[PDB]
Design a protein around this ligand. Sequence first.
Ligand SMILES: Nc1ncnc2c1ncn2[C@@H]1O[C@H](COP(=O)(O)OP(=O)(O)O)[C@@H](O)[C@H]1O
Ligand SMILES: CC(=N)NCCC[C@H](N)C(=O)O
Ligand SMILES: [Mg+2]
Length: 356
Amino acid sequence: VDQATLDKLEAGFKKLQEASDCKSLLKKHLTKDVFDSIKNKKTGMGATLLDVIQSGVENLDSGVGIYAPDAESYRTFGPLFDPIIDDYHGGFKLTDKHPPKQWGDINTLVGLDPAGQFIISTRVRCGRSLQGYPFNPCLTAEQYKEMEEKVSSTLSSMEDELKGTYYPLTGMSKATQQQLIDDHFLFKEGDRFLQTANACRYWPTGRGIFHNDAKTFLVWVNEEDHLRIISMQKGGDLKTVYKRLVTAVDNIESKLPFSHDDRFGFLTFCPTNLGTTMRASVHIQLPKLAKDRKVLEDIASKFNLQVRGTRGEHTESEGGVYDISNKRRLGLTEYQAVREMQDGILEMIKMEKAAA
Ligand SMILES: Nc1ncnc2c1ncn2[C@@H]1O[C@H](COP(=O)(O)OP(=O)(O)O)[C@@H](O)[C@H]1O
Ligand SMILES: CC(=N)NCCC[C@H](N)C(=O)O
Ligand SMILES: [Mg+2]
């Protein structure tokens, strides 16, 4: 680790201590001891502690603040990752290992809001990394193109409900892109947390979206993760949404090799996405409970749920519509993760009906 990198780290650590109102897990868990123990370490691809913490140093409003530039980073910088992962995912010890993939009994899932007065739409996503490719900050432009080719070629073999078309971001009209983002289908462009993590280099090369005509099945290529595999539709039919995701992931898994770790389950760029990589969410209105987004968040947290704005994380609610989802992804099965959202949303709706 060169001297220029060390200077920036010491200055970054200092900045974090002085940021009296910073509430990120990075600040909370980067103790002087932790800091000194790993700041001189480097991975085989040259990822340093700076590459890990830089996004959180520059964006003090980060909730977490770190990313893994490569798989090795998760262990090379373990003393920082380990406590943060344990913290975020609601308990995960050094000796713990993520359980084997288990979708569970899909037939046990229910409709989340039969009368249709609270839930707007339901969505479940997963993420995957291609074996042989590092995470965003270590990728070259050429690698983005190689991966885009591989993934798009694989998805051309999808059939029936899952059959669809790949749309590259390169050459995509501003109008077409903007509508897809507005309609909650395409990942947004230019995220400051990802940018400062050097996750958006060479944009928009290699980036794009696959989807069926109904746009109930989508795959993001080369945004935050190599793949995000998405099932979504209007209404509260979680069972169908989850079933479609399972079918899609099972099919893609037979064709493309994805990175899996004995301890961390499926590997992802952010530690929040490890394990099941699963975020099951609803867009929901709860006017009585949501009379203060912090009261809503406090209610949600007891159900292990996270609250986001209408256009995704780091955004506000619009027209009272919130994104509410399972927070935890690692140290529980796919089934357990989706059930936490279902169970939490069902009770919150009950609470809403009862609220004065
Ligand atoms: N239940 C949902 N129904 C409709 N759109 C959703 C739902 N949950 C998330 N989205 C959309 O997904 C997109 C990505 O948002 P983010 O908060 O970045 O989620 P992810 O885990 O998908 O990266 C945003 O446009 C957000 O509106
Ligand atoms: C997309 C994603 N990984 N969100 C979780 C953390 C995001 C951001 N780096 C933060 O620390 O708030
Ligand atoms: Mg995102």
